[PDB]
Nucleic acid binder design. Structure first.
Ligand code: SF4
Ligand code: MG
Lengths: 261, 1153, 261, 261
DNA sequence: AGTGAAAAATCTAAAGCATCACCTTGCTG
DNA sequence: CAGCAAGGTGATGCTTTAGATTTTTCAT
């Protein structure tokens, strides 16, 4: 048992559908704040943070801060019952190692259990540094994806520059260099289209085009991506799930030996 | 033109004076002399008219120890094909066009192989073109080859056009052949001279040519003067030895068991003395020591030593690659030309031969033809395996340490490799090749260096000239081939033997295994065993049934055994391992079936043979599976696009070259470009371009050819068995002689004994090389149809034996040589027979062998077989033969089968079978040891095989395997806690060979290229520039995320000063946040764990899972398909059908409309 | 001389889509009462019959009980051609060896005609009587697909157990299990969402749920499916397709043994 | 200096999307008349002609003729970044070694500058005769795409008949011959969904379906696609663009010779 | 501790297919 | 006037495959 209660299950299946590629196996932490997971990819270079608060859910039941060793690939094959509006129920786990997954249709007439055993996954612990970042680019994620997917298949590396007149995505690769620039939006009020760049000093960061291709595969989960950077620090990619969840991409900065400048 | 003749005559005088200073006195005095031929070389010798002319100088040894030579001149020649009624004109034209270059042109008939209606008496009239000399031969051949090529093309086009419509004068030449046959090959074929025979050379005066004749009654073989030189250079570590800067410090050689070592003083600090080394009493040699201040005096001492000894045979390890070029360059530094003192010369084939001496390479024998594994065909493993002692070995990288401080160790190593190659030569290789060239017409140089295809070529050369058969020329790889469906081809073959392993596990005589058993086959056995034993007595022993007394007793004993076995048709019983190896199916199938490549006709070409009566008796039909990969481009589309490409011009190969039309490009480049454009033309119009097709085809084998191939293999295996019986009786005589203890008769008997062994081994090896000749291209008598027919008929026999052992047990392993089976012991295999014959009173016939013999007699005996009886009246008798003899092996103690990791695909020739006494018996094609392989899995795998035979049941033997597996995983999961670092470091090295500078691969990334770049950035570029280096490396783990090529760190980073090593590993690690520099941590431990895991999956766990036994080791995972089959097998809720579980309404089938 | 007219060709499209990947060869047989599908599947484990009766065709006419043996692995490509609402005229002959299909556009603009080749067959036929079934359940087809196809991925076999409380689906596999529980509904207003169960005695049958994954793809035929079963008897999956006929899946269970201990 | 604006980016997206899968190179011809791309494909049995007239662009001018042969696969790979509503612009020089493409959003915020390496190859202008076609037929693009994808399954070639009544598709194969007949649908006020024929004399021509399945990749380019065909004359797919110029797909009809008849 | 070339088998990225979720739109309560 | 179902469309896992690449296998 002990599956977190929420009237909708669109996010609960789509976050795992997006996370299923970068991370094969991970561990889930339940605490009084809510559900959390810090995970590393296969090559152990990038960090993925998912925080979904219990107060961001409907209502909360728990027994203790507990770490659960559930895999993320084969387990993300039973979540296609829970559509965009299916209801979960939550209750404390007494003594069994099995975690269930109950799915309730909106008709409230058919339930379905999903009993999964637990295997021990040992995950390392660390403290992610936090600091004031030079530039944060907040911009809608659908066009971010449809530009990244079309500048990433021609090249292999990307260089981002934070500038007042425009942030530049240099696509360094074999076929050729191409780049996009984004100024400040001043004539659009609606948040679903406008781009803003809260920036203080210019900086250049280098990253992999495949990594930015796979990172932005969670587009239907969110609506606006923010990219946060400072002087040669890892990129922090924020997606916000309404006002109840946040996911962070924390890939390490692959700056070469003074190749940028 | 005169300068070339002057150079050739100077070369001839140099060779003659070299021969006179090596004691080969050219026979000029008249009279008789006895001799024993040892070598053969063409050399131009002037005739009586002071005119250029080629000759070959035979070298003869005499039993008293004095050599000589004899020159014989003859006219080099080939044959050409002429149109009908066009023999005189072409001969007259070519004689008038090259007066002074053609000695004699005339017609001579020779029977060909492909001519229609040819088996009635008509013969093809060829024409000889004989010249004065071999360079005239080369000039005329290269003058005529494009002419005859374009003539063949134009007559093919004209004939095709005329047949399509109906349904440098040089217009009569058709095809010129036997052009690449050497001169001395042609002489040894024509005048019938081989090597290793005794001849009565006659030479009266100088006017008459020398007269030679075989004298084979002197069966004793004299000893030629042999010499085994090997070298060593001043090699600095981690470097290819330089052919200019390095120079010899130490050589040794063995003149007929007498040792002589030659050493320098400027390298060796103190002098060395004579000594004796004896690991086995048969190997010995006293090593005479020569010491000289300078290396020029070293090479002069060797030169004058071989001048005063005159060694006809010289033998070496890797002569044509390392020894001769190095000593030649090193002597050319000091101004002693190798083409003036010894004789050997740089030839056009990259090889080295002397006009008078023999240059031998034991590596090429032990690699090509000793049938030893490819992973260990070097000299040290051949000394361990063949000769049976451990040779003295030393690391070449640190030879300078004991160049001064322990010169005795260096001297021992040099003399040990010298004595090893010498004794390995004289014991096996020397009598083997001389027995080979008793029937092979060439010097030991070529026949040692050629492939088995050329040896079988020489055999068919000999008997084809004997049978008056013109040779076929080597085939032409004719591109743009289209089959009946009208498609272009990429690669087409026959189908090989489908070597499988139908189930896997552990099978021993003590272990009671399952037997699922069909009683119907034993009903046949109960009703047929009398005929089975009758056939076994009348055919295997070739003894009629009237000469046995206890026949009924043993027959009823077999009846009782078979009935008692039959009473329980499902058993858990202890088997015996029974190896149904008929033994080289392919020669036996050619014997039974009479596959001749001359006619081997198909439809519309069979009607030529004029004795094809309606009672079709020569029509042998057999089936085989043709496979081919083709593009879908049909005749029409390919025709359209080839005209399309014809329409424009082509880019010239030369820079700023002129435009060339379609008719003057080379066929290879135009085929390459045509394939390149057709690939990406059909890539976007058919959705598929690589389509395989494996179809069934029936081909007919003519049964009344002149049949030189089947005759050679038949009479040749006949002489094999004759020499085998002669070896048996002479080995009995040898045992009697060594029990008696005499001196000279035991020596003569041992000489004849090793003669007969070398004969029979040569015969056997070339019998199982007749299949290697016909299997692949590069052969004149190359037919795809022999390979297909013989391979599929061998597969057919072996699979019928498989299915007829499946009903009487659990056959075990299926091969393209012979099945391995396990049988219930209730089958009889041996007894004591009582026969009326006094000389042979007992008969031991294995009953399963008898029943397989009788069923192959019933099924696959040639009843269509024909034979000549009298040639003039075309008397063809119809006979029947079956030599497919399933000789069987005794009950073997143990056998282990491995299994693959893929569904459908099954392993090719992998198993292991053990010897009854407790040792090992036989492997095949297996991963015990291989070049470019990690050393951990080899020692693990041999340890598992050798720690195996203890056990009582399947669970017990799998527990004993798990014992050593658990030991190895315990010592390998401990991260090498208390085991030596040097042993592990040598144990996990992986070596890859690179050459050809750096431009061979172009622009690509492999592990060898990555290590080449790693050494390029290590210290310099010159260590990557020089070719022929084997780089050693280990896969690391710390740069995670990079592919497998980037993480292959070499081992030169492990052989420097520790601080700069730390700098290099920080450079190649792309980070500097670490503080430790442990050698054990950087190693990719899990990579080696999963490699050992894949090995033990192939060898143990998956073979266990195909049996109904528990998983052997739980410390390793399993493939997902294996895990789901294991979980799906053991459920009682698995399958219930509907036909037998519920009633069906009846039988009904659909009709028209 | 066979003619079958159909104003709603989508149901024919859907039935021949629903069993393409099941069987290899189509052993149809036409008769005066209707067309039956007496086809034996290649894997030889289950049986399926379609019965198209004369009260659903716009124009139905036959001559005798003619058997049709066209290949069906070559069939759901011609029946992927017409739109969702074309007019299907399927024709055959007593003496001619060519099946004919005619698709008419609703607005009469895109008429299509398909010919066919014929060949003989040889495969057994099963005969099942009309025996009374213990537990009959009525299920909405969409929810039936949601449970069946999505338990087909967690599991390889399914347990259909009917007791007094309700019908349950206990499907197990290589990673975990799913225990679907059903609750009775009585105050329902419309029959496509109504679940009512006829009880005789508690039963329990094990099935290869992979075959049910083949089977459930007939969901868009009829909004209501009826599942009837007893002990040691092929379960029937019955689709009553809009008063055109009915499609029956007779699937053979697997016998129960005391392998628990 | 070459500066070309175009408000709608859809048509100059779809033209080179259709040109992408069939041609792997290009030879741009920028003249005073406009923009031309007359190219051969890999098979050298068909012709493609992109014509973009000068007056269709709002602002477009030239000073000399340029023949710059960049490949076409790379261009259609890089130009997929923007949408179908984005305003496109091409910027180049009189001797430019690398041109630039600006993609400005409707709100003039998402602005691009994408560039690639350029090469040159054989640039040839083959004869483009506008011979009087015997049969010219105009069909909606969706219906024609559906019918080509329809007939691609049955066989690998379609024979087309033009008559007084209309057009007749036919495709033969091992599934049987299927023929589809369309008459003039001049009974609707929408010419986009109607079909129109003009007719001289009846001919029957069979065409290869891999090349038609590559031709009709331009599904969204036009509301109606017209194609013209005559006896032994190449099929001319005249993709009509309402904004500027057109696209021409020329194919030599495949007719089998007497090698089998 | 040769090389040298074919080649059958093996590894990896590109394309074809049917499927799944979503966007758009017309008909009706 | 909006709710809901039907049709079109683009993204995606999966399987097939085509070209490069690697070890074998015999040729000198
Ligand atoms: S099969 Fe008989 S008739 Fe035909 S070629 Fe051979 S021997 Fe002559
Ligand atoms: Mg040597």
């Amino acid at each position: 048992m002990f599956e977190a209660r929420l009237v909708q299950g669109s996010i609960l299946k789509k976050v795992l559908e997006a996370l299923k590629d970068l991370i094969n196996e991970a561990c889930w932490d339940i605490s009084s704040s809510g559900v959390n997971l810090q995970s590393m990819d296969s090559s152990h270079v990038s960090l993925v943070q998912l925080t979904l608060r219990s107060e961001g859910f409907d209502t909360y039941r728990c027994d203790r801060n507990l770490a659960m060793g559930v895999n993320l690939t084969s387990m993300s094959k039973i979540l296609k019952c829970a559509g965009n509006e299916d209801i979960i129920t939550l209750r404390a786990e007494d003594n069994a190692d099995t975690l269930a997954l109950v799915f309730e249709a909106p008709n409230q007439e058919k339930v379905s259990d999903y009993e999964m055993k637990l295997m021990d996954l040992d995950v390392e612990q660390l403290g992610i540094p936090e600091q004031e970042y030079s530039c944060v680019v907040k911009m809608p994620s659908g066009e971010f994806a449809r530009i990244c997917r079309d500048l990433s298949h021609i090249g292999d590396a990307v260089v981002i520059s934070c500038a007042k007149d425009g942030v530049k995505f240099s696509a360094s690769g074999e076929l050729g260099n191409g780049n996009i620039k984004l100024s400040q939006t001043s004539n659009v009020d609606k948040e679903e289209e406008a781009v803003t760049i809260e920036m203080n000093e210019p900086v250049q960061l280098t990253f992999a085009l495949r990594y930015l291709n796979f990172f932005t595969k969670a587009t239907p989960l969110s609506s606006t991506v923010t990219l946060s950077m400072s002087a040669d620090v890892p990129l922090v990619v924020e997606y916000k799930i309404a006002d109840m969840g946040h996911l962070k991409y924390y890939l390490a900065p692959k700056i070469e030996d003074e190749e940028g400048s | 033109s005169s300068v070339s003749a002057l150079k050739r005559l100077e070369r001839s005088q140099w060779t003659d004076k070299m021969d006179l200073r090596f004691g080969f006195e050219r026979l000029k005095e008249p009279g008789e002399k006895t001799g024993w031929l040892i070598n053969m070389h063409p050399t131009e010798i002037l005739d009586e008219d002071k005119r250029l002319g080629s000759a070959v100088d035979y070298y003869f040894i005499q039993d008293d120890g004095s050599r000589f030579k004899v020159a014989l001149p003859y006219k080099p020649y080939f044959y050409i094909a002429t149109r009908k009624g066009c023999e005189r004109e072409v001969s007259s034209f070519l004689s008038k066009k090259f007066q002074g270059k053609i000695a004699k042109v005339e017609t001579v008939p020779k029977e060909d192989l492909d001519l229609p209606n040819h088996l009635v008496g008509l013969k093809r009239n060829y024409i000889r073109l004989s010249f004065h000399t071999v360079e005239d031969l080369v000039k005329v051949r290269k003058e005529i080859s494009p002419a005859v090529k374009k003539n063949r093309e134009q007559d093919h086009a004209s004939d095709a056009y005329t047949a399509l419509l109906s349904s440098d004068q040089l217009d009569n030449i058709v095809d010129m052949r036997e052009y690449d046959v050497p001169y001395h090959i042609r002489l040894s074929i024509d005048l019938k001279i081989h090597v290793a025979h005794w001849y009565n050379v006659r030479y009266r005066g100088n006017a008459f040519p020398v007269e030679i004749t075989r004298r084979d009654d002197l069966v004793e073989r004299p000893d030629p003067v042999v010499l085994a030189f090997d070298i060593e250079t001043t090699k600095l570590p981690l470097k290819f030895p330089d052919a200019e800067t390095d120079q010899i410090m130490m050589i040794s050689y063995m003149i007929d068991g007498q040792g002589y070592l030659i050493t320098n003083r400027e390298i060796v600090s103190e002098d060395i003395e004579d000594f004796e080394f004896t690991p086995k009493p048969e190997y010995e040699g006293p090593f005479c020591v020569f010491n000289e201040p300078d290396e020029a005096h070293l090479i002069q001492r060797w030169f004058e030593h071989v001048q005063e000894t005159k060694p006809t045979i010289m033998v070496t390890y890797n002569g044509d690659f390392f020894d001769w070029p190095f000593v030649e360059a090193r002597a050319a530094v000091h101004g002693l030309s190798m083409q003036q003192e010894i004789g050997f010369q740089k030839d056009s084939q990259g090889e080295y031969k002397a006009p008078q001496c023999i240059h031998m390479d034991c590596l090429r024998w032990v690699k090509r033809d000793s049938y030893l594994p490819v992973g260990s065909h070097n000299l040290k493993a051949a000394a361990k395996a063949k000769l049976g002692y451990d040779p003295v070995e030393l690391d070449p990288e640190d030879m300078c340490r004991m160049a001064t401080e322990q010169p005795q160790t260096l001297a021992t190593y040099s003399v040990s490799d010298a004595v090893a190659t010498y004794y390995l030569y004289m014991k096996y290789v020397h009598p083997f090749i001389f027995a080979l060239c008793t029937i092979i017409p060439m010097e030991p140089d070529e026949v040692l260096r050629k492939g088995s295809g050329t040896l079988c070529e020489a055999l068919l050369m000999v008997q084809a000239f004997h049978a008056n058969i013109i040779f076929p020329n080597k085939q032409e790889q004719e591109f743009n081939k289209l089959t009946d469906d009208g498609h272009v081809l990429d690669s087409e073959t026959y189908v090989g033997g489908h070597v499988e392993a139908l189930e896997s596990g552990v099978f021993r005589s003590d272990i009671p295994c399952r037997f699922r058993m069909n009683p119907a086959a034993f009903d046949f056995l109960l009703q047929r065993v009398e005929k089975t034993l009758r056939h076994a007595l009348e055919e295997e022993e070739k003894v009629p049934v009237e000469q046995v007394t206890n026949f009924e007793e043993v027959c009823d004993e077999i009846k009782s055994k078979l009935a008692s076995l039959k009473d329980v048709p499902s058993r858990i019983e202890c088997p015996l391992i029974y190896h149904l190896d008929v033994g080289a199916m392919y020669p036996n199938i050619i014997l039974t079936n009479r596959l001749q490549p001359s006619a081997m006709v198909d439809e519309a070409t069979c009607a030529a043979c004029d004795f094809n009566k309606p009672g079709a008796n020569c029509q042998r039909k057999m089936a085989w599976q043709w496979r081919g990969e083709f593009m879908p481009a049909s005749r029409s589309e390919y025709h359209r696009i080839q005209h399309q490409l014809e329409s424009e011009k082509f880019p010239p190969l030369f820079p700023e070259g002129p435009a060339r039309a379609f008719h003057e490009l080379s066929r290879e480049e135009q085929a390459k470009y045509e394939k390149r454009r057709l690939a990406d033309y059909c890539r976007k119009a058919y959705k598929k371009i690589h389509i395989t097709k494996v179809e069934e085809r029936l081909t007919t084998i003519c049964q009344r050819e002149n049949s030189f191939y089947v005759d050679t293999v038949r009479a040749f295996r006949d002489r094999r068995y004759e020499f085998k019986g002669l070896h048996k009786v002479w080995k009995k005589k040898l045992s009697a002689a060594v029990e008696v203890g005499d001196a000279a008769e035991v020596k003569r008997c041992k000489n004849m004994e090793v003669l007969y062994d070398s004969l029979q081994l040569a015969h056997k090896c070339i019998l199982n090389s007749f299949y290697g000749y016909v299997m692949r291209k590069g052969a004149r008598w190359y037919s795809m149809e022999m390979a297909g027919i013989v391979c599929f008929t061998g597969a057919n026999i072996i699979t019928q034996a498989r299915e007829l052992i499946e009903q009487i047990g659990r056959p075990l392993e299926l091969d393209t040589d012979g099945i391995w089976c396990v049988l219930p012991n209730s089958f009889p295999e041996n007894f004591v027979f009582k026969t009326t014959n006094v000389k042979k009173p007992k008969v031991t016939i294995s009953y399963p062998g008898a029943m397989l013999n009788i069923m192959v007699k019933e099924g696959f005996t040639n009843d269509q077989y024909q034979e000549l009886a009298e040639p003039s009246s075309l008397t063809y008798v119809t006979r029947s033969e079956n030599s497919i003899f399933f000789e069987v092996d005794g009950p073997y103690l143990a056998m282990i089968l491995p299994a693959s990791k893929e569904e459908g695909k099954k392993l090719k020739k992998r198993y292991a079978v053990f010897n009854e006494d407790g040792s090992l018996a036989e492997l095949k094609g297996f991963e015990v040891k291989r070049r470019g392989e990690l050393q951990l899995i080899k020692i693990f795998q041999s340890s598992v095989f050798e720690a195996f035979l203890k056990g009582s049941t399947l669970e017990e033997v799998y527990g004993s395997v798990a014992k050593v597996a658990d030991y190895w995983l315990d010592v390998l999961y401990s991260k090498a806690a208390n085991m030596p670092d040097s042993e592990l470091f040598e144990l996990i090295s992986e070596n890859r060979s690179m050459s050809r500078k750096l431009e061979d691969y172009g622009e690509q990334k492999s592990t060898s290229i990555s290590t080449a770049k790693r050494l390029a950035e290590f210290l310099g570029d010159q260590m990557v520039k020089d070719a022929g280096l084997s780089c050693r490396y280990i896969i690391s783990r710390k740069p995670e995320g990079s592919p497998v090529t980037e993480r292959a760190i070499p081992l030169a980073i492990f052989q420097a000063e520790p601080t700069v090593r730390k700098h290099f590993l920080r450079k190649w690690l792309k980070s500097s946040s670490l503080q430790d520099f442990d050698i054990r941590a950087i190693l990719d431990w899990d990579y080696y764990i999963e490699r050992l895991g894949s090995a033990i999956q192939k060898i143990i766990t998956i073979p266990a899972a195909l049996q109904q036994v528990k998983n052997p080791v739980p410390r390793v995972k399993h493939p997902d398909w294996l895990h789901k089959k294991l979980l799906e097998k053991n459920d009682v809720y698995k399958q219930k059908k509907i036909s037998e579980l519920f009633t069906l309404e009846g039988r009904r089938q659909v009709t028209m409309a």
